[PDB]
Design a protein around this ligand. Structure first.
Ligand SMILES: CN(C)C(=O)c1cc2cc(c1)C(=O)N[C@H]([C@@H](O)CO)Cc1cccc(c1)OCCCCO2
Length: 367
Protein backbone atom coordinates (compact mmCIF):
# COMPACT_ATOMS: atom_id res chain seq x y z
CA UNK A 1 0.00 0.00 0.00
CA UNK A 2 3.12 2.13 -0.01
CA UNK A 3 2.69 3.63 -3.51
CA UNK A 4 0.42 6.30 -1.96
CA UNK A 5 3.38 7.56 0.09
CA UNK A 6 5.94 7.65 -2.72
CA UNK A 7 6.92 11.26 -3.45
CA UNK A 8 5.07 12.63 -0.38
CA UNK A 9 8.01 14.88 0.59
CA UNK A 10 8.98 18.30 -0.76
CA UNK A 11 11.94 20.54 0.03
CA UNK A 12 15.73 20.38 -0.19
CA UNK A 13 18.73 19.65 2.02
CA UNK A 14 19.31 23.34 2.72
CA UNK A 15 15.86 24.29 4.03
CA UNK A 16 14.52 20.86 5.07
CA UNK A 17 12.14 18.21 3.73
CA UNK A 18 8.50 18.41 4.74
CA UNK A 19 5.42 16.20 4.63
CA UNK A 20 1.81 17.35 4.54
CA UNK A 21 -0.26 16.76 7.68
CA UNK A 22 -3.59 17.83 9.14
CA UNK A 23 -4.31 18.54 12.81
CA UNK A 24 -7.63 19.15 14.54
CA UNK A 25 -11.31 18.82 13.67
CA UNK A 26 -12.12 20.08 11.07
CA UNK A 27 -8.66 19.22 9.67
CA UNK A 28 -6.19 22.10 9.40
CA UNK A 29 -3.53 21.45 6.75
CA UNK A 30 0.13 22.19 7.55
CA UNK A 31 3.53 21.30 6.04
CA UNK A 32 5.70 19.58 8.64
CA UNK A 33 9.50 19.32 8.62
CA UNK A 34 10.71 15.70 8.80
CA UNK A 35 13.36 15.63 11.58
CA UNK A 36 15.06 12.44 12.76
CA UNK A 37 17.22 14.63 15.04
CA UNK A 38 14.50 15.47 17.60
CA UNK A 39 11.43 13.94 19.21
CA UNK A 40 8.79 16.69 19.61
CA UNK A 41 5.84 17.32 17.30
CA UNK A 42 5.27 21.09 17.22
CA UNK A 43 3.50 23.55 14.94
CA UNK A 44 3.40 27.30 14.56
CA UNK A 45 0.32 28.41 16.49
CA UNK A 46 0.61 32.24 16.48
CA UNK A 47 1.35 34.74 13.69
CA UNK A 48 4.96 34.96 12.53
CA UNK A 49 6.57 36.85 9.62
CA UNK A 50 7.75 33.61 7.97
CA UNK A 51 4.53 31.61 8.49
CA UNK A 52 1.79 31.72 5.85
CA UNK A 53 -0.55 29.69 8.08
CA UNK A 54 -0.63 28.26 11.58
CA UNK A 55 -2.51 25.99 13.94
CA UNK A 56 -5.60 27.65 15.41
CA UNK A 57 -6.58 25.73 18.54
CA UNK A 58 -9.81 27.71 18.99
CA UNK A 59 -11.09 26.30 15.67
CA UNK A 60 -10.59 22.60 16.56
CA UNK A 61 -13.31 20.81 18.52
CA UNK A 62 -10.96 17.91 19.35
CA UNK A 63 -8.20 20.10 20.82
CA UNK A 64 -7.35 19.38 24.45
CA UNK A 65 -5.15 21.67 26.54
CA UNK A 66 -2.48 19.97 28.64
CA UNK A 67 -1.91 23.14 30.72
CA UNK A 68 1.88 22.74 30.54
CA UNK A 69 4.59 24.81 28.81
CA UNK A 70 7.54 23.47 26.81
CA UNK A 71 10.66 24.71 25.06
CA UNK A 72 12.86 22.82 22.61
CA UNK A 73 16.37 23.99 21.67
CA UNK A 74 17.99 22.77 18.49
CA UNK A 75 21.50 23.26 17.15
CA UNK A 76 19.93 25.95 14.96
CA UNK A 77 17.06 27.82 16.58
CA UNK A 78 14.64 27.18 19.42
CA UNK A 79 11.00 27.73 20.28
CA UNK A 80 8.67 27.69 23.26
CA UNK A 81 5.01 26.87 23.35
CA UNK A 82 2.03 25.27 25.07
CA UNK A 83 1.38 21.53 25.17
CA UNK A 84 -1.89 19.90 24.15
CA UNK A 85 -3.27 16.98 22.16
CA UNK A 86 -5.34 16.79 18.99
CA UNK A 87 -6.19 14.43 16.17
CA UNK A 88 -3.56 14.16 13.45
CA UNK A 89 -3.50 12.59 9.98
CA UNK A 90 -1.06 12.32 7.09
CA UNK A 91 -2.97 12.64 3.77
CA UNK A 92 -0.22 10.92 1.78
CA UNK A 93 0.56 8.48 4.56
CA UNK A 94 -1.30 5.61 6.20
CA UNK A 95 -5.09 5.92 6.28
CA UNK A 96 -5.29 6.52 10.03
CA UNK A 97 -5.96 9.24 12.58
CA UNK A 98 -4.16 9.41 15.91
CA UNK A 99 -4.43 11.59 18.98
CA UNK A 100 -0.93 12.99 19.39
CA UNK A 101 0.94 15.37 21.64
CA UNK A 102 1.34 18.76 19.97
CA UNK A 103 3.40 21.73 21.06
CA UNK A 104 1.62 24.91 19.97
CA UNK A 105 4.53 27.23 19.15
CA UNK A 106 3.93 30.72 20.55
CA UNK A 107 7.45 32.14 20.52
CA UNK A 108 10.54 31.21 18.56
CA UNK A 109 14.06 32.35 17.73
CA UNK A 110 15.76 31.56 14.40
CA UNK A 111 13.56 28.46 14.05
CA UNK A 112 11.18 29.14 11.15
CA UNK A 113 12.94 29.73 7.83
CA UNK A 114 11.81 32.43 5.41
CA UNK A 115 10.34 30.75 2.33
CA UNK A 116 10.82 27.17 3.53
CA UNK A 117 7.08 26.40 3.04
CA UNK A 118 6.83 24.44 6.31
CA UNK A 119 5.04 25.48 9.49
CA UNK A 120 5.95 22.80 12.03
CA UNK A 121 8.32 19.98 12.86
CA UNK A 122 7.87 16.22 13.23
CA UNK A 123 10.49 14.87 15.61
CA UNK A 124 10.92 11.18 14.76
CA UNK A 125 13.60 10.25 17.32
CA UNK A 126 12.91 8.59 20.68
CA UNK A 127 11.17 9.71 23.88
CA UNK A 128 14.47 9.84 25.77
CA UNK A 129 15.24 13.24 24.17
CA UNK A 130 11.67 14.57 24.11
CA UNK A 131 10.96 17.86 25.93
CA UNK A 132 10.13 18.63 28.68
CA UNK A 133 11.00 15.01 29.57
CA UNK A 134 10.65 11.47 28.28
CA UNK A 135 7.05 11.09 29.47
CA UNK A 136 5.83 13.22 26.53
CA UNK A 137 5.10 10.46 23.99
CA UNK A 138 6.53 11.22 20.52
CA UNK A 139 4.27 11.18 17.48
CA UNK A 140 5.57 7.97 15.93
CA UNK A 141 5.18 6.15 19.25
CA UNK A 142 1.55 7.30 19.42
CA UNK A 143 1.01 6.20 15.81
CA UNK A 144 2.32 2.69 16.48
CA UNK A 145 0.45 2.42 19.80
CA UNK A 146 -2.96 3.49 18.45
CA UNK A 147 -2.89 1.83 14.98
CA UNK A 148 -1.53 -1.28 13.23
CA UNK A 149 1.26 0.68 11.50
CA UNK A 150 4.48 -1.38 11.86
CA UNK A 151 7.22 0.18 13.98
CA UNK A 152 9.49 1.44 11.20
CA UNK A 153 9.70 4.10 8.52
CA UNK A 154 12.04 4.84 5.67
CA UNK A 155 13.29 8.05 4.06
CA UNK A 156 14.33 8.54 0.44
CA UNK A 157 15.54 12.14 0.23
CA UNK A 158 16.22 13.30 -3.34
CA UNK A 159 18.61 16.20 -3.94
CA UNK A 160 11.45 15.98 -3.22
CA UNK A 161 11.46 12.48 -1.75
CA UNK A 162 9.48 9.81 0.06
CA UNK A 163 8.68 8.98 3.66
CA UNK A 164 7.32 5.43 3.70
CA UNK A 165 5.50 5.12 7.01
CA UNK A 166 5.28 1.57 8.32
CA UNK A 167 7.52 -0.23 5.87
CA UNK A 168 10.00 -0.45 3.03
CA UNK A 169 9.13 0.22 -0.63
CA UNK A 170 11.47 -1.94 -2.65
CA UNK A 171 10.85 0.04 -5.82
CA UNK A 172 12.75 2.98 -4.25
CA UNK A 173 16.23 1.39 -4.06
CA UNK A 174 18.62 -0.96 -5.88
CA UNK A 175 21.05 -3.56 -4.64
CA UNK A 176 21.12 -4.78 -1.05
CA UNK A 177 20.10 -3.08 2.18
CA UNK A 178 22.96 -2.97 4.68
CA UNK A 179 22.08 -2.59 8.37
CA UNK A 180 23.88 -0.92 11.28
CA UNK A 181 22.73 -1.24 14.92
CA UNK A 182 20.98 1.62 16.62
CA UNK A 183 23.45 1.99 19.49
CA UNK A 184 20.97 3.56 21.90
CA UNK A 185 17.38 4.72 21.48
CA UNK A 186 17.61 8.46 21.96
CA UNK A 187 18.95 10.07 18.84
CA UNK A 188 19.28 7.59 15.96
CA UNK A 189 22.79 6.87 17.22
CA UNK A 190 25.21 4.76 15.16
CA UNK A 191 28.90 3.81 15.31
CA UNK A 192 31.35 4.70 12.50
CA UNK A 193 34.26 2.26 12.47
CA UNK A 194 36.46 3.54 9.62
CA UNK A 195 36.76 6.53 7.30
CA UNK A 196 38.56 6.57 3.92
CA UNK A 197 39.06 9.44 1.47
CA UNK A 198 39.76 8.41 -2.14
CA UNK A 199 40.54 4.98 -0.76
CA UNK A 200 43.05 6.28 1.83
CA UNK A 201 42.32 5.41 5.46
CA UNK A 202 42.24 8.46 7.72
CA UNK A 203 43.93 6.16 10.28
CA UNK A 204 42.55 7.93 13.34
CA UNK A 205 41.46 6.12 16.46
CA UNK A 206 37.91 5.22 15.48
CA UNK A 207 36.65 6.66 18.78
CA UNK A 208 37.35 10.08 17.23
CA UNK A 209 34.71 9.38 14.55
CA UNK A 210 32.03 8.99 17.24
CA UNK A 211 33.18 11.63 19.76
CA UNK A 212 30.88 12.05 21.54
CA UNK A 213 28.20 10.41 19.36
CA UNK A 214 27.30 9.81 15.72
CA UNK A 215 23.69 10.28 14.63
CA UNK A 216 21.55 10.15 11.47
CA UNK A 217 19.66 13.45 11.17
CA UNK A 218 17.35 14.30 8.25
CA UNK A 219 16.86 17.77 9.81
CA UNK A 220 20.52 18.80 9.50
CA UNK A 221 21.82 19.80 6.07
CA UNK A 222 25.53 19.04 6.30
CA UNK A 223 27.78 16.16 7.07
CA UNK A 224 29.04 17.48 10.43
CA UNK A 225 32.27 16.05 11.85
CA UNK A 226 34.06 16.33 15.22
CA UNK A 227 36.82 18.95 15.13
CA UNK A 228 39.74 16.52 14.84
CA UNK A 229 38.00 14.48 12.14
CA UNK A 230 36.91 17.63 10.30
CA UNK A 231 40.50 18.91 10.22
CA UNK A 232 41.82 15.61 8.85
CA UNK A 233 39.09 15.43 6.20
CA UNK A 234 39.52 19.05 5.07
CA UNK A 235 43.30 18.63 4.81
CA UNK A 236 42.77 15.54 2.65
CA UNK A 237 40.08 17.15 0.47
CA UNK A 238 42.24 20.26 0.02
CA UNK A 239 45.18 18.07 -1.02
CA UNK A 240 43.09 16.19 -3.59
CA UNK A 241 41.74 19.43 -5.10
CA UNK A 242 44.94 21.53 -4.88
CA UNK A 243 44.79 21.83 -8.69
CA UNK A 244 42.50 24.77 -7.93
CA UNK A 245 42.59 27.10 -4.95
CA UNK A 246 39.58 28.25 -2.98
CA UNK A 247 39.00 31.13 -0.56
CA UNK A 248 39.72 30.08 3.02
CA UNK A 249 36.07 30.84 3.85
CA UNK A 250 34.84 28.31 1.30
CA UNK A 251 36.14 25.49 3.52
CA UNK A 252 34.27 27.05 6.47
CA UNK A 253 30.95 27.04 4.61
CA UNK A 254 30.80 30.85 4.35
CA UNK A 255 31.85 31.67 0.76
CA UNK A 256 30.41 29.88 -2.24
CA UNK A 257 32.52 28.76 -5.21
CA UNK A 258 31.44 29.03 -8.84
CA UNK A 259 32.51 27.61 -12.18
CA UNK A 260 31.39 28.27 -15.74
CA UNK A 261 28.04 26.51 -16.17
CA UNK A 262 28.59 22.81 -16.81
CA UNK A 263 32.35 22.84 -16.12
CA UNK A 264 32.39 21.92 -12.42
CA UNK A 265 35.63 19.91 -11.92
CA UNK A 266 34.01 17.03 -10.02
CA UNK A 267 37.00 14.75 -10.58
CA UNK A 268 39.34 16.84 -8.42
CA UNK A 269 37.16 16.25 -5.33
CA UNK A 270 37.49 12.90 -3.53
CA UNK A 271 34.87 10.34 -2.56
CA UNK A 272 34.39 9.75 1.18
CA UNK A 273 33.65 6.27 2.53
CA UNK A 274 32.02 5.90 5.96
CA UNK A 275 32.21 2.36 7.35
CA UNK A 276 29.41 1.51 9.79
CA UNK A 277 29.21 -1.26 12.36
CA UNK A 278 27.38 -4.23 10.87
CA UNK A 279 24.95 -6.87 12.15
CA UNK A 280 27.40 -9.77 12.73
CA UNK A 281 30.63 -10.15 14.70
CA UNK A 282 33.62 -8.27 13.24
CA UNK A 283 31.55 -7.18 10.18
CA UNK A 284 31.05 -3.67 8.81
CA UNK A 285 29.84 -2.16 5.52
CA UNK A 286 30.54 1.12 3.79
CA UNK A 287 28.61 3.95 2.26
CA UNK A 288 30.48 6.04 -0.29
CA UNK A 289 29.72 9.77 -0.68
CA UNK A 290 30.42 11.64 -3.94
CA UNK A 291 31.39 15.34 -4.18
CA UNK A 292 28.01 16.01 -5.79
CA UNK A 293 26.59 15.36 -2.30
CA UNK A 294 28.96 17.41 -0.16
CA UNK A 295 29.15 20.34 -2.62
CA UNK A 296 25.65 21.69 -2.12
CA UNK A 297 24.32 23.70 -5.10
CA UNK A 298 23.12 27.21 -4.32
CA UNK A 299 27.32 29.75 -13.37
CA UNK A 300 27.14 26.66 -11.15
CA UNK A 301 27.80 27.67 -7.54
CA UNK A 302 28.23 25.52 -4.44
CA UNK A 303 28.67 25.65 -0.69
CA UNK A 304 30.97 23.18 1.08
CA UNK A 305 28.46 21.09 3.05
CA UNK A 306 30.94 19.45 5.42
CA UNK A 307 31.29 21.42 8.63
CA UNK A 308 32.71 21.15 12.12
CA UNK A 309 30.85 19.88 15.18
CA UNK A 310 31.39 19.79 18.94
CA UNK A 311 28.47 17.40 19.60
CA UNK A 312 29.64 14.45 17.46
CA UNK A 313 29.20 13.32 13.87
CA UNK A 314 25.92 14.24 12.16
CA UNK A 315 24.99 12.37 8.97
CA UNK A 316 22.72 15.08 7.62
CA UNK A 317 20.60 15.39 4.52
CA UNK A 318 23.46 15.61 2.04
CA UNK A 319 24.63 12.17 3.23
CA UNK A 320 21.10 10.71 3.19
CA UNK A 321 20.41 12.04 -0.31
CA UNK A 322 20.98 9.33 -2.88
CA UNK A 323 20.49 6.60 -0.24
CA UNK A 324 17.34 4.85 0.88
CA UNK A 325 17.45 4.91 4.68
CA UNK A 326 15.35 2.50 6.75
CA UNK A 327 14.72 3.47 10.38
CA UNK A 328 13.91 -0.06 11.58
CA UNK A 329 12.86 0.77 15.13
CA UNK A 330 11.34 -2.67 15.73
CA UNK A 331 14.70 -4.34 15.14
CA UNK A 332 16.85 -1.47 16.47
CA UNK A 333 18.76 -0.96 13.25
CA UNK A 334 19.16 1.48 10.39
CA UNK A 335 19.43 0.24 6.81
CA UNK A 336 21.17 1.91 3.88
CA UNK A 337 20.80 1.15 0.17
CA UNK A 338 21.55 2.97 -3.06
CA UNK A 339 18.50 5.11 -3.80
CA UNK A 340 16.61 5.04 -7.09
CA UNK A 341 17.21 8.83 -7.16
CA UNK A 342 20.94 8.44 -6.94
CA UNK A 343 23.79 10.85 -7.58
CA UNK A 344 25.21 10.65 -11.11
CA UNK A 345 28.92 11.08 -11.77
CA UNK A 346 30.50 9.85 -15.00
CA UNK A 347 33.28 7.62 -13.70
CA UNK A 348 32.18 7.23 -10.06
CA UNK A 349 29.03 6.17 -8.23
CA UNK A 350 27.70 6.40 -4.69
CA UNK A 351 27.59 2.92 -3.21
CA UNK A 352 26.61 0.77 -0.22
CA UNK A 353 29.03 -2.14 -0.12
CA UNK A 354 29.81 -5.11 2.08
CA UNK A 355 30.61 -7.18 3.91
CA UNK A 356 33.89 -5.94 5.39
CA UNK A 357 35.83 -7.37 8.31
CA UNK A 358 36.66 -4.88 11.05
CA UNK A 359 38.06 -5.98 14.38
CA UNK A 360 37.33 -4.36 17.75
CA UNK A 361 34.32 -2.36 16.50
CA UNK A 362 32.97 -2.00 20.07
CA UNK A 363 36.03 0.09 20.95
CA UNK A 364 34.86 2.70 18.42
CA UNK A 365 31.94 3.80 20.59
CA UNK A 366 32.54 6.72 22.92
CA UNK A 367 31.75 6.53 26.64
C1 LIG B 1 25.68 24.76 12.61
N1 LIG B 1 24.28 24.46 12.30
C2 LIG B 1 23.34 25.55 12.55
C3 LIG B 1 23.93 23.26 11.82
O1 LIG B 1 24.74 22.37 11.63
C4 LIG B 1 22.48 22.99 11.53
C5 LIG B 1 22.00 23.07 10.23
C6 LIG B 1 20.67 22.78 9.97
C7 LIG B 1 19.81 22.41 10.99
C8 LIG B 1 20.29 22.30 12.29
C9 LIG B 1 21.63 22.59 12.56
C10 LIG B 1 19.36 21.89 13.40
O2 LIG B 1 19.49 22.34 14.53
N2 LIG B 1 18.42 20.98 13.07
C11 LIG B 1 17.41 20.49 14.01
C12 LIG B 1 17.73 19.07 14.52
O3 LIG B 1 17.75 18.14 13.43
C13 LIG B 1 19.09 19.07 15.20
O4 LIG B 1 19.02 19.77 16.46
C14 LIG B 1 16.03 20.52 13.31
C15 LIG B 1 15.74 21.87 12.71
C16 LIG B 1 15.43 22.96 13.51
C17 LIG B 1 15.17 24.20 12.96
C18 LIG B 1 15.21 24.39 11.60
C19 LIG B 1 15.53 23.32 10.78
C20 LIG B 1 15.80 22.06 11.32
O5 LIG B 1 15.55 23.63 9.45
C21 LIG B 1 15.78 22.58 8.50
C22 LIG B 1 16.68 23.16 7.44
C23 LIG B 1 18.12 22.72 7.55
C24 LIG B 1 18.92 23.55 8.49
O6 LIG B 1 20.18 22.86 8.69
Amino acid sequence: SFVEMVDNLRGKSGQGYYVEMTVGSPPQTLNILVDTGSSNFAVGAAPHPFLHRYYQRQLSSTYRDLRKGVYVPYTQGKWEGELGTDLVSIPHGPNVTVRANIAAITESDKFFINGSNWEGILGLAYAEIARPDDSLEPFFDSLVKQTHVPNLFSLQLCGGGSMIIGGIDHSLYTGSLWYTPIRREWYYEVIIVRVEINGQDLKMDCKEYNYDKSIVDSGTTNLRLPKKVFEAAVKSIKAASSTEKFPDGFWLGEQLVCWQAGTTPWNIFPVISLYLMGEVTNQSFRITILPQQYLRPVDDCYKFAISQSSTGTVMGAVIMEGFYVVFDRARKRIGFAVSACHVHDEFRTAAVEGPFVTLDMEDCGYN
